[PDB]
RNA sequence: UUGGGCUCUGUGGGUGCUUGGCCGCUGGCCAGACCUACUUCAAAGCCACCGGGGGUACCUACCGGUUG
């Protein structure tokens, strides 16, 4: 009813939950600000899909994020995949399908793992 | 699972391809085709003991 | 039970490997009784996932 | 490339349940498949079809004895007429009743048609082709007369020679004799007394004696003779005979009053032909095991034609020499795979019936079947050198045929007994791979050894799709492991690589420019990955882009129809520009592989006998008894071999039982003509062949204002500026114009023309001169043209090889055709006469 | 006339003119309605909906002025001879003219109305009544009434028979008199005078279901009912206002429906051609009224462009049904209700065409290759401010595309009562529409009910959104449409400049509708969203590319890379689609002023209409004009393409349509119409053309005589080794013709009886085939060798079928022992002749091959032909060496070019 | 915009290409009407779907006989 999509994010044993609902642009991880959540040097890496999308995509929404499990690199990676998959699914359910294809084409065009839980697998040379 | 794989023969003749074929007025094959006899020179004769 | 099952299949929610299912007498061999599962995106799948809280609309 | 694809010709079948006819000449063969009708020309091996269509299956066709006009009749009333040499629609018309009989008059003015009860004669409206100052009428069909002195279905009609009278075969055991007008020595009379129904009456040539053949195998010659008590003459029976076909009942009988021969076609698959007025058996023969649907004769009388409904089974049969003319087996299954040879003058199909069959694209005819495969046949594949095909089926065994001598020269079973569902082969023809539902490991064999090279593995479940890279090195498998597996094989140290997917795999295909590989996943998405940097160059959805639904027996809208949103297969274009895909769904998509858009979408059927083919259906035919096509009309017949229901309950795939009424549309695959400029989808109804209509659409390359056909002719004749004339001819791209100027240039200026000809315009010229090589009687002209081209642009074509690859291949097919057609005979004859002069 | 397009039909029409319908009952289950187009007549079914049963052919050359339909035949009088037009009456049956009525030569009057009864037909012209015996269709007499006054002698109103009176006609004068004449003797037997003679003229008259009572409608107002042999007035009614006279009347014979109980009969419907209302009276006690139907159509007005009225009423046979045909191209059949009482009927059937001409005209693209297809649905934007989806296939399955419960909106308000009117409530008229069914998924598009033009995405983006854009007159907002749902969507789009919309088009993929204003700005909206995304330009030099004038002619490339946009004055600007930015422009500012364009994909071709009466066609990639044309003489009304890039059709102000052949860059056709044609439309594949004239509502349909028959029309006006033509199949089977008969010999033989019938009667042309071309090949070859030209026998063997050819090639013989009698030697010399002719290398070598194959003993036994073999061998070795080196060079380097990295 | 909403029901259209309602139809009717005649010769066979193993007193059928 109310504009709401909910999207996971996957790593080895990091996993993250994010809730994309309508807003004016607030973003918090566990309730604390995004510019506060990381080992602060990876904060740019987390900032990435924002910097490809342009903020006005993020202008109309509001995201809560949950993360849990695992270490730091694991966590930040989970946050970014939740950001990406969540904003794609929010556009899917609530604006133009051509705009969803726009974000997906652009973001995937940048980096593959921002949309796929490509799992670390166990196939050495046999 | 399909069947037991059974041994099976099929006796060929020495006729041409267009003789083996089904019923048409004129084959898709041209003229360089229409003469090979379904069996190689190895088939028509094998030098052996 | 077989009411829910049969009605479910009539409105078509059960893929078998790749095909869909309309005709509730598709006999299922022992080899196929693993690859039965639910279809591309149905609300039954989302009943499952809405319950176990892995509901991810993507 | 330029994508303006239009409906070219039909193939994939030979016939359907419906009326067969001859041209009044005797060369053109008129056959119904479904709704669309095809003609086969029997002297030059030619064939095509007509661009009309019909919403149901065809029941009866008629033709004028002059020839040029055809009137096609589907069931449930609706009808369309067409001009046969200029194969266009002329008129549409609505009957509102199910036909049962049809006969054009030899007058070329009338035709008699039978709706089940009512009987109607209609005049034939004029055509704009036949009047000089004339046009189409608005409601052109005009009712002439109609009679309802009858009680049942009206089975057959036969005019007289004079077009004054005709006989009608009923179903209520009667025949009826009528006059077009009110004659003087005529009564609109009736022939009575039978046991099992007049299936066919016939006049003689002399309009004195007549015949009625009846379904219980009973013939009756009648004459207009007096009553046996002696102004007082009656059309009464003078003699009768039976065919002692013991345990059947015939269905279709024809009779040439010209040569006075009668042919009879039966329920036990064996027909009999007879010298009728003396009733002497010419002979009999079993054409099939099933039965006979329709029988016809040549106008001259030398040929017999038979269409059997159940199996494909169209055969024309020369009786005087006791040999066939053609005997064609069409699919009673779904066409699980299709592929042209790299030659591309032939397609081999494989259906789930067991039969596999090689047909040629020219002539539309089947040259061969292989039938040793004891189960439904899944996919097949060709090599680079194309002289060998590989087949995999559901018998659990792979077989490999050389395609110059046509034998199973390789036979595999896998040891731990599998059941194959997808196969592929190395392009060089060195190793086969096959992938299964029994044991999910993927299997590689080597064509020379034939013993098992290796199980590969790395798959959570069965491998659904198989494809090879045309270089010879890289494999891809695709499977419900949620994996796309790139298999690095023919280095020393083999490896895998995953492309993980958010979803599951249904098909994989390649770019000939082997950097690019695409995946069809069942959520609908298509994805192109760069093959070395194993990474997504692009992805796109296809759910709504193929969402065509409401298959019968579904209580969903065509909104939410699952399993009509899977792209069964994909294929890039011959250059590698447009991905073509098509599935279990009404529609086929065609996309650009650069910026990922729908270039072109195309329908797979218009028909409506078949099931889920028009994404909304209606509140008329939905009864309260459920959907109306579904109440079992296998329960109402007179044919016991129809009333039997040998089905088991619910098996979505193949069996002899064959519930096989209202099949759905599944568009079982597509294949591009490797010569380019044509492709064909293989579908449950048949095999629809679209081409590139570059003839009836104007398309210049890069024109100027002052470039006109008159100006081309001016610089041709007066100025004789040959290069400029050629390049403006190409710049216009008009077919007859370019043909004319090509013939116009003499064979000496070709060298300077190619010497200062532009490389922007070379490749289309190579295609065109290949077309000239294919279609024109000017060989040495074309060949010296080619020699000059290769002399000039040998280095440049060797530099590119890839933007020009399909044109290079069509040059290859031109030269190879000329070579294997002529120069073999040339050498053979010079050696022949040399030894004969040596004596 | 023209050379390409033949006239086929005028559509958009059920009953626009003033002529009333005529209605017959078929059996006890159907009622035929018959209505005049104006150049034809159609007959509709009543029970089977309101689909069209018969269409009248051929067209009358003039406007029809009268009709009536009997048990089978359609009698139609056409022609007002007072202005030029030839007149006549025709007899049709089942849409086709069976007969023609013999007019009196002395008829300088248009023929008003028609009546049929007994064995006689009577036809009233202006003051004159002519009679034919219907049993013979022959002229019998002519009735001439007389009055003292030039006015009073006029036969207004009409005439009728009573049901129980033998051969008596009842006519109304321009005076208030009704005259009874016996038609058998042709004698005026009686006349009846109007009571209270202030009433002027009998405006109508109708027999009642009771015996011998006539109802008379007076232009002065009174409705009277009178005994017609007693001359006894039954009732007066003051129902006609002075300048608002009644048009006509009818009684209810259904047997019940009056007295407010449902338990009474005798109801009168009456109507006036000044209104759009009709009126209902219970006749029993006081002849009371009970019920007004308010605005059953649009009433006629001269202040407005709206056209309408009420041309007739009728109670049919004994049922609650009443038809009214108006002049608003309008039929609505009404129905009395039983279970309650009701004053009025409610509607139960309808067919409608516009009340004003058609402004814009457009076709629908194919259900991409299916049946909904090229030539089914044509959208028409009528100057009655509406949008209609017309069916070329079955005219009934056309429909309006409503804008809601608009009629109920009016009824809640007072648009139907007595402020603006209903056209002023519906959206303004239509500048230009574009369609794209690249998403138009039909009735399922949005499940539910949706708001309209407002100024949620899962379900929508699953199936389907709106698909038709329309530019309107003076709104700054342009409008969307759900095509496959037949209603207005929810989306309007402004310009942002606020200037009223100039023109609108849509993406190749149904995604963004794009509008260009008269202010200059170009805007883009995503339909699934209904959201603005791009203005042209946003913020060469970027940021500054705005059009300085009105913007007509905006389209997009189908790849959606570049969008081309024409300013009315000045230039055409091409824009990077994704960036919203001006890439490349072309200006003709100081000499032209571009007034439109059409763009055909499949050709990358655009024609531009420019105010110097010219059309400039550009190929879009090479960014330069390619095909300019100067043929027009007024301003360009409308132009359209060919499917193929071969034709351009154009209509101008002077009712002159000129057609150009694009490849030859020439004039083909030019033809003048009776009216200026406003809009042009061409079927999405090449069969049909639809043109929209001015004034005449209901567009015209033409066919493609070129698509059927070939026309040679090119009149630009102002007012060496070769092959043959033989089947490759034929010569290859001539070489291979034993093995084919092996493969066509049946595996199991046919089982002939032991009693074999010897001497079957033969078939074909006297025992042998029809395939032998009919008129001694040895005589032919021998006389060619007596001559030097073997070419007759050569062409004979060329035209041979393969069996007879093999028979002939085995049938040779040396003969008597002479060099002039050996067909073998003559054959070899014919072959050497063809080789030095360099004509048929293939057939030559093939016939040589099979000849060598089956005559070897004789040729190694004879040397007189071995000489010929040696000479021919020299020639063939030369040809073989040349061609072999050539083709081997070609194929070898073909292989080297196809696989060089080895 | 001088009231509006949800929800349900009822009618017509269309959800496929525009050739009559009926009959004892080369014709007639729709208000119908006429109503019971005339008569030379029964038919050619075959096929024909029941769940499995098992019993056969009686019945049916087939085959081969028997009195009359």
- Full DSSP string of D154-209: --EEEE-SSSSEEEEE-SSS-EEEEESS--SS----EE---SS-EEEEEE-SSTTE
Q: In the beta sheet, which residues pair with residue D527?
A: D519, D539
Contact D507, E423 (CB under 8 A): no
The beta-carbon contacts of A91-95 under 8 Å, at least 24 apart in sequence, are: A92/A5, A92/C57, A92/C58, A92/E457, A92/E458, A92/E461, A93/A5, A93/C57, A93/E457, A93/E458, A94/A3, A94/A5, A94/E456, A94/E457, A95/E457, A95/E528, A95/E529, A95/E531
Q: How many whole angstroms separate alpha carbon E748 and alpha carbon E538?
A: 81
Q: In sequence order, which residues have a C-beta less than 8 Å from that of residue A61 and are 6 or more positions away?
A: A20, A21, A22, A23, A25, A87, A90
E46-CA/F21-C1' distance, Å: 11
Query: Among candidates D493, D464, D491, which has minimal Cα distance to D477?
Result: D464
Q: In sequence order, which residues have a C-beta less than 8 Å from that of residue E877 and are 6 or more positions away?
A: D830
Q: Residue C56 and residue A92: Cβ atoms within 8 Å?
A: no
Contact D297, D336 (CB under 8 A): no
Interface test with E, best of B26, B30, B32 (most E CBs within 10 A): B26
Reply yes or no: is the peptide bond before residue D562 cis, omega within 30 of 0: no
Residue A24, annotated ligand binder? no
Closest-approach nucleotide to residue D89, Cα vs C1': F17
Chain C positions touching A6 (Cβ under 8 A) are 55-57
The two three-digit tokens of residue E1, written as one number? 């006339």
* Other residues' Cβ atoms within 10 Å of the Cβ of residue E344: 16
D176-CA/F36-C1' distance, Å: 25
Q: In what order do the strands lie in the sheet with E30-36?
A: E22-26, E30-36, E41-45, E52-55
DSSP state of E613: T
DSSP state of D75: G
The two three-digit tokens of residue D8, written as one number? 């070219």
Query: Among candidates E471, E458, E448, which has minimal Cα distance to E529?
Result: E458
Query: Among candidates E600, E852, B39, which has minimal Cα distance to D836?
Result: E852
Interface test with D, best of E763, E847, E900 (most D CBs within 10 A): E763
Token look-up 């020639």 returns E875
Q: Residue B26 and residue E729: Cβ atoms within 8 Å?
A: yes
How many CA atoms are closer than 13 Å to the CA of E266, on its beta-carbon side? 14
Contact E398, E355 (CB under 8 A): no
Q: How many whole angstroms separate alpha carbon E269 and alpha carbon E291?
A: 9
Q: Is E78 helix (H, G, I), strand (E, B) or coil?
A: strand
Q: Residue D553 and residue C18: Cβ atoms within 8 Å?
A: no
Select from C22, C25, C58 the Cβ nearest to the Cβ of D553: C22
Q: How many whole angstroms separate alpha carbon D380 and alpha carbon D400?
A: 9
Contact A57, A42 (CB under 8 A): no
Contact E504, E432 (CB under 8 A): yes
Query: Among candidates D376, D377, D378, D380, which has minimal Cα distance to D389?
Result: D380
| A in contact with E (at least 3 C-beta pairs within 8 A) | yes
Q: How many whole angstroms separate alpha carbon D344 and alpha carbon D362?
A: 10
Contact D564, D587 (CB under 8 A): no
Reply yes or no: is the peptide bond before residue E58 cis, omega within 30 of 0: yes
Chain A positions touching C55 (Cβ under 8 A) are 6
Q: Residue B31 and residue E846: Cβ atoms within 8 Å?
A: yes
Q: Report strand pairing: D252-256 vs D233-242.
A: unpaired
Chain D positions touching A112 (Cβ under 8 A) are 535-536
* Alpha-carbon E370 to chain mean position: 19
Residue burial E186-218, b: 16+ Cβ < 10 Å; e: rest:
bebeeebebeeeebbbbbbbbbbbeebbbbbbb
How many CA atoms are closer than 13 Å to the CA of E479, on its beta-carbon side? 28
Interface test with A, best of D441, D455, D487, D496 (most A CBs within 10 A): D496
D707 phi and psi, to 5 degrees? -115, 105
Select from A93, A96, A99 the Cβ nearest to the Cβ of E458: A93
* Alpha-carbon D200 to chain mean position: 31
* Interface list for E 332-371 with D (CB within 8 A): 367-371
What residue of A is the nearest CA neighbor of D500?
Answer: A118
Burial class (CB within 10 angstroms; exposed 0-12, middle 13-18, buried 19+) of E452: middle
Q: In what order do the strands lie in the sheet with D119-123?
A: D99-104, D110-115, D119-123, D143-147
Q: How many whole angstroms separate alpha carbon D350 and alpha carbon D377?
A: 6
Q: In sequence order, which residues have a C-beta less than 8 Å from that of residue D359 and are 6 or more positions away?
A: D11, D346, D347, D348, D349, D365, D366, D367
Q: Residue D366 and residue B22: Cβ atoms within 8 Å?
A: yes
* Interface list for D 15-34 with E (CB within 8 A): 25-27
Q: Is D717 helix (H, G, I), strand (E, B) or coil?
A: helix
Q: How many whole angstroms separate alpha carbon E79 and alpha carbon E88?
A: 6
E362-CA/F28-C1' distance, Å: 49
Chain D positions touching E730 (Cβ under 8 A) are 43-44
* Alpha-carbon D469 to chain mean position: 30
Q: In sequence order, which residues have a C-beta less than 8 Å from that of residue D648 and are 6 or more positions away?
A: D655, D657
The two three-digit tokens of residue C7, written as one number? 């009605």
Integer angstrom CA distances of residue E796 from D45, E770, E801: 21, 15, 10
Chain D positions touching B32 (Cβ under 8 A) are 820-821, 824
Contact D114, D102 (CB under 8 A): yes
Q: In sequence order, which residues have a C-beta less than 8 Å from that of residue E857 and are 6 or more positions away?
A: none
Integer angstrom CA distances of residue E555 from D368, E431, E519, E600: 52, 16, 18, 10
- How far does the CA of residue C14 sit from the closest CA of chain D (Å)? 9
Contact A35, A74 (CB under 8 A): no
Q: Residue E526 and residue A96: Cβ atoms within 8 Å?
A: yes
Contact D734, D709 (CB under 8 A): yes
Q: How many whole angstroms separate alpha carbon D134 and alpha carbon D140?
A: 13
| A in contact with B (at least 3 C-beta pairs within 8 A) | no
Q: Which nucleotides of F are covered by protein (CB under 7 A)?
A: 2-4, 6-7, 11-27, 30, 40-41, 43-49
Q: Residue E732 and residue B27: Cβ atoms within 8 Å?
A: yes
Query: What is the phi-psi region of residue D497: left when phi exceeds 0, alpha when psi lies from -120 to 50, beta otherwise?
Result: beta
Q: Residue C11 and residue D556: Cβ atoms within 8 Å?
A: yes
- Which method was used? cryo-EM
DSSP state of D354: S
| D in contact with C (at least 3 C-beta pairs within 8 A) | yes
Q: How many whole angstroms separate alpha carbon D120 and alpha carbon D112?
A: 6
DSSP alpha helix (H) spans, E709-865: 728-735, 739-744, 777-786, 791-798, 802-810, 823-837, 841-854, 856-861
Closest-approach nucleotide to residue D147, Cα vs C1': F25
Q: Residue E645 and residue D587: Cβ atoms within 8 Å?
A: no
Q: In the beta sheet, which residues pair with residue D649?
A: none
Residue burial A90-111, b: 16+ Cβ < 10 Å; e: rest:
bbbbbbbbbbbbbbbbebbeee
H or E segment to which residue D245 belongs: none
Q: Report strand pairing: E689-693 vs A27-29.
A: unpaired
- How far does the CA of residue A37 sit from the closest CA of chain E (Å)? 33
Q: How many whole angstroms separate alpha carbon E609 and alpha carbon E617?
A: 9
């Amino acid at each position: 009813s109310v504009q709401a999509v909910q999207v996971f994010g996957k790593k080895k044993n990091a996993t993250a939950v994010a809730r994309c609902v309508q807003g004016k642009g607030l973003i918090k991880v566990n309730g604390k600000p995004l510019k506060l959540f990381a080992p602060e040097i990876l904060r740019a890496k987390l900032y990435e899909p924002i910097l490809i999308l342009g903020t006005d995509k993020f202008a109309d929404v509001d995201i809560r994020i949950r993360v849990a499990g695992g270490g730091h690199t694991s966590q930040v990676y989970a946050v970014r995949q939740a950001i990406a998959k969540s904003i794609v699914a929010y556009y899917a359910k609530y604006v133009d399908e051509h705009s969803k294809n726009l974000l997906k084409q652009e973001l995937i065009q940048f980096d593959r793992s921002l949309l796929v839980a490509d799992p670390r697998r166990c196939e050495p040379k046999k | 699972k399909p069947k037991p794989p059974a041994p099976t023969l099929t006796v060929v003749s020495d006729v041409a391809t267009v003789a083996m074929e089904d019923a048409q007025p004129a084959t898709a094959q041209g003229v360089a085709g229409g003469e090979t006899s379904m069996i190689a020179p190895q088939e028509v004769y094998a030098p052996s003991k | 039970t077989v009411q829910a099952a049969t009605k479910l299949i009539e409105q078509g929610h059960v893929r078998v490997g790749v095909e869909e299912v309309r005709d509730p007498a598709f006999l299922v061999t022992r080899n196929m009784e693993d690859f039965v599962t639910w279809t591309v995106g149905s609300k039954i799948k989302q009943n499952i996932m809405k319950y176990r809280d892995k509901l991810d609309d993507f | 490339m330029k994508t303006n694809f239009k409906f070219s010709n039909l193939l994939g079948t030979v016939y359907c349940r419906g009326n067969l006819l001859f041209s009044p000449d005797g060369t053109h063969l008129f056959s119904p498949v479904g709704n669309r009708v095809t003609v086969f020309n029997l002297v030059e091996n030619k064939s095509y079809t007509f661009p009309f269509a019909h919403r149901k299956n065809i029941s009866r066709i008629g033709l004028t004895p002059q020839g040029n006009l055809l009137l096609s009749i589907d069931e449930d009333g609706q009808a369309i007429l067409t001009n046969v040499p200029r194969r266009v629609v002329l008129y549409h018309f609505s009957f509102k009743s199910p036909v049962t009989a049809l006969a054009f008059s030899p007058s070329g003015r009338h035709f008699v048609v039978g709706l089940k009860r009512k009987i109607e004669v209609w005049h034939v409206p004029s055509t704009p082709d036949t009047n000089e100052d004339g046009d189409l009428e608005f409601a052109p069909f005009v009712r002439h007369h109609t009679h309802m002195q009858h009680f049942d279905d009206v089975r057959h009609l036969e005019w007289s020679s004079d077009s004054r009278f005709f006989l009608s075969a009923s179903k209520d055991l009667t025949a009826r004799i009528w006059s077009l007008d009110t004659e003087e020595g005529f009564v609109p009379t009736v022939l009575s007394g039978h046991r099992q129904g007049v299936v066919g009456a016939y006049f003689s040539k002399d309009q004195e004696t007549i015949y009625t053949v009846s379904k219980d195998g009973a013939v009756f010659e009648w004459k207009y003779v007096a009553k046996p008590g002696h102004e007082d003459m009656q059309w009464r029976i003078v003699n009768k005979h039976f065919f002692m076909q013991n345990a059947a009942t015939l269905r279709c009988a024809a009779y040439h009053a010209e040569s006075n021969l009668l042919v009879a076609g039966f329920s036990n698959g064996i027909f009999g032909l007879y010298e009728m007025p003396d009733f002497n058996l010419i002979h009999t023969l079993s054409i099939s095991q099933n039965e006979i649907d329709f029988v016809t004769i040549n106008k001259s009388g030398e040929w017999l034609a038979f269409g059997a409904s159940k199996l494909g089974q169209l055969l024309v049969w020369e009786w005087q020499s006791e040999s066939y003319i053609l005997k064609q087996q069409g699919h009673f299954d779904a066409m699980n795979s299709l592929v042209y040879s790299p030659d591309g003058q032939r397609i081999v199909t494989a259906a789930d019936d067991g039969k596999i069959k090689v047909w040629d694209v020219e002539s539309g005819f089947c040259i061969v079947t292989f039938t040793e495969h004891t189960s439904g046949v899944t996919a097949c594949e060709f090599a680079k050198k194309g002289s060998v095909l590989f087949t995999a089926s559901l018998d659990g065994s792979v077989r490999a045929w050389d395609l110059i001598r046509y034998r199973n020269f390789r036979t595999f079973t896998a040891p731990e007994r599998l059941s194959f569902t997808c196969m592929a082969v190395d392009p060089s023809g060195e190793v086969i791979a096959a992938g299964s539902i029994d044991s999910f490991d993927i299997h590689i064999w080597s064509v020379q050894t034939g013993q098992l090279l290796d199980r590969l593995s790395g798959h959570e479940g069965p491998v659904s799709s198989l494809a090879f890279a045309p270089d010879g090195s890289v494999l891809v498998s695709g499977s419900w492991d949620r994996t796309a597996r790139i298999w690095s094989i023919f280095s020393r140290t083999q490896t895998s690589e995953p492309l993980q997917l958010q979803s599951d795999v249904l098909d994989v295909a390649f770019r000939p420019d082997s950097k690019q590989i695409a995946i069809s996943t069942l959520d609908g998405q298509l994805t192109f990955w760069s093959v070395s940097e194993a990474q997504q160059v692009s992805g796109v959805d296809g759910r709504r882009d193929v969402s065509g639904g409401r298959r019968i027996t579904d209580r969903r809208t065509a909104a939410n129809v699952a399993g009509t949103k899977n792209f069964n297969t994909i294929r890039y274009s011959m250059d590698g520009t447009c991905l073509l895909a098509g599935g279990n769904s009404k529609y086929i998509c065609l996309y650009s592989t650069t910026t990922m858009v729908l270039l072109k979408k195309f329908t797979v059927s218009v028909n409506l006998s078949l099931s889920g083919t028009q994404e909304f259906l209606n509140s008329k035919l939905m009864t309260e008894a459920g959907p109306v096509g579904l109440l079992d009309d296998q329960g109402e017949a007179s044919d016991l071999e129809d009333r039997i229901d040998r089905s088991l309950p619910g098996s979505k795939r193949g069996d002899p039982g064959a519930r096989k009424k209202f099949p759905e549309v599944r568009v079982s695959g597509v294949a591009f003509s490797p010569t380019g400029n044509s492709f064909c989808a293989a579908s449950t109804e048949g095999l629809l062949v679209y081409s590139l209509d570059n003839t009836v659409q104007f398309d210049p390359f890069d024109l100027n204002m002052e470039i006109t056909p008159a100006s081309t002719l001016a610089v041709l004749e007066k100025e004789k500026d040959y290069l400029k004339a050629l390049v403006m001819a190409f710049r216009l791209n008009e077919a007859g114009l370019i043909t004319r100027v090509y013939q116009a240039i003499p064979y000496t200026d070709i060298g300077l023309v190619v010497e200062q000809f532009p490389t922007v315009y070379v490749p289309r010229l190579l295609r065109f001169v290949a077309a000239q090589t294919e279609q024109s009687p000017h060989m040495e002209f074309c060949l010296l043209w080619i020699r000059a081209l290769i002399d000039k642009h040998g280095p440049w074509l060797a530099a590119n090889r890839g933007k020009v690859d399909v044109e290079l291949r069509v040059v290859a097919r031109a030269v190879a055709k000329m070579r294997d057609e002529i120069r073999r005979l040339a050498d053979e004859n010079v050696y022949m006469v040399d030894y004969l002069l040596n004596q | 006339g023209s050379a390409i397009f033949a006239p086929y039909r005028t559509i958009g029409l059920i009953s626009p003119t003033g002529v009333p319908f005529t209605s017959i009952p078929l059996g006890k289950t159907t009622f035929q309605i018959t209505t005049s187009v104006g150049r034809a007549l159609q007959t509709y079914d009543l029970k089977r909906g309101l689909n069209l049963v018969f269409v009248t052919r051929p067209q009358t050359p003039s406007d029809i002025t009268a009709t009536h339909a009997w048990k089978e035949r359609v009698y139609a009088a056409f022609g007002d001879p007072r202005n030029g037009e030839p007149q006549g009456l025709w007899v049709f049956q089942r849409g086709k003219k069976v007969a023609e009525l013999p007019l009196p030569s002395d008829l300088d009057q248009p023929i008003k109305q028609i009546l049929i009864f007994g064995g006689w037909i009577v036809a009233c012209a202006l003051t004159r009544i002519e009679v034919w015996k219907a049993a013979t269709l022959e002229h019998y007499t002519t009735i001439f009434p007389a009055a003292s006054k030039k006015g009073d002698n006029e036969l207004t109103g009409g005439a009728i028979n009573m049901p129980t009176f033998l051969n008596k006609i009842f006519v109304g004068r321009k005076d208030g008199w009704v005259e009874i004449w016996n038609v058998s003797t042709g004698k005026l037997i009686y006349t009846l005078l109007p009571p209270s003679p202030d009433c002027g003229a009998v405006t109508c008259l109708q027999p009642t279901p009771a015996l011998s009572l006539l109802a008379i409608a007076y232009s002065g107002g009174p409705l009277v009912i009178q005994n017609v042999l007693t001359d006894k007035t039954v009732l007066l009614l003051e129902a006609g206002t002075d300048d608002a006279p009644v048009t006509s009347i009818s009684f209810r014979t259904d047997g019940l429906g009056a007295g407010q109980d449902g338990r009474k009969d005798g109801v009168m419907a009456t109507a006036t051609s000044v209104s759009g209302d009709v009126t209902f009276w219970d006749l029993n006690k006081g002849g009371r009224i009970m019920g007004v139907l308010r605005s059953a159509h649009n009433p006629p007005s001269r202040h407005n462009i709206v056209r309408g009225g009420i041309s007739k009423i009728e109670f049919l046979a004994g049922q609650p049904v009443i038809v009214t045909s108006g002049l608003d191209n309008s039929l609505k059949t009404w129905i009395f209700d039983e279970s309650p009482f009701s004053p009025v009927p409610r509607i139960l059937h309808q067919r409608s065409g516009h009340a004003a001409p058609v402004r814009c005209l457009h076709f629908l693209p194919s259900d991409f290759d299916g049946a909904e297809g090229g030539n089914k649905w044509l959208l028409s934007g009528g100057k009655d401010r509406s949008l209609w989806g017309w069916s070329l296939r079955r005219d009934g399955q056309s429909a309006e595309l409503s804008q809601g419960a608009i009629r109920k909106k009016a009824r809640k308000m007072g648009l139907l009562a007595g402020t603006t009117t209903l056209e002023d409530l519906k959206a303004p008229e239509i500048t230009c529409i574009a369609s794209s069914l690249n998403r138009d998924g039909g009735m399922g598009a949005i499940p539910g009910k949706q708001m309209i033009w407002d100024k949620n995405a899962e379900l929508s983006g699953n199936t389907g959104w709106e698909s038709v854009v329309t530019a309107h007159k003076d709104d700054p907002y342009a409008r969307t449409w759900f095509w496959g749902r037949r209603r207005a969507g929810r989306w309007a789009f402004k310009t942002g400049d606020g200037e009223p919309v100039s023109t609108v088009a849509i993406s190749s993929c149904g995604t963004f509708a794009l509008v260009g204003s008269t202010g200059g700005s170009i805007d883009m909206f995503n339909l699934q969203s209904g959201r603005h995304r791009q203005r042209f330009p946003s913020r060469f030099a970027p940021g500054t590319g705005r059009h300085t004038n009105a913007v007509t002619g905006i389209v997009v490339d189908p790849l959606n890379r570049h969008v081309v946009s024409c300013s009315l004055d000045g230039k055409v600007k091409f824009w990077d689609f994704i960036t919203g930015n001006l890439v490349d422009e072309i200006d003709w500012a100081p000499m032209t002023k571009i007034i439109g364009c059409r763009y055909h994909p499949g050709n990358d071709l655009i024609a531009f209409a420019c105010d110097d009466r010219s059309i400039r066609v550009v190929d879009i990639e090479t960014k330069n004009t390619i095909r300019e044309f100067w043929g027009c003489r007024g301003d360009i009304n409308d132009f359209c393409f060919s499917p193929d890039g071969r034709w351009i059709v154009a209509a101008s102000q002077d009712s002159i349509i000129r057609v150009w052949d694009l490849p030859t860059a020439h004039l083909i056709d030019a033809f003048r119409l009776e009216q200026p044609c406003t809009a042009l439309a061409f079927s999405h594949t090449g069969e049909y053309l639809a043109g929209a004239m001015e004034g005449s509502l209901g567009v015209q349909i033409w066919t493609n005589r070129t698509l059927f028959r070939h026309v040679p029309t090119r009149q630009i006006s102002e007012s060496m080794m070769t092959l043959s033509l033989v089947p490759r199949s034929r010569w290859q089977t001539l070489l291979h013709i034993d093995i084919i008969k092996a493969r066509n010999k049946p595996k199991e033989p046919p089982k002939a009886p032991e009693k074999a019938p010897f001497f079957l009667p033969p078939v074909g042309q006297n025992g042998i085939s029809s395939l032998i071309p009919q008129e001694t090949f040895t005589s032919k070859l021998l006389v060619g060798g007596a001559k030097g030209d073997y070419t007759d026998f050569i062409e004979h063997l060329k035209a041979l079928p393969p069996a007879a050819a093999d028979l002939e090639l085995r049938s040779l013989s040396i003969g008597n022992g002479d060099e002039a009698t050996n067909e073998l030697l003559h054959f070899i010399r014919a072959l050497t002749s063809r080789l030095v002719a360099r004509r048929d290398y293939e057939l030559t070598q093939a016939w040589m091959t099979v000849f060598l194959r089956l005559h070897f003993d004789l040729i190694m036994e004879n040397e007189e032909l071995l000489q010929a073999l040696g000479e021919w061998r020299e020639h063939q070795a030369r040809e073989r060496d040349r061609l072999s080196e050539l083709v081997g060079y070609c194929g070898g380097v073909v292989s080297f070019l196809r696989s060089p990295r080895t």
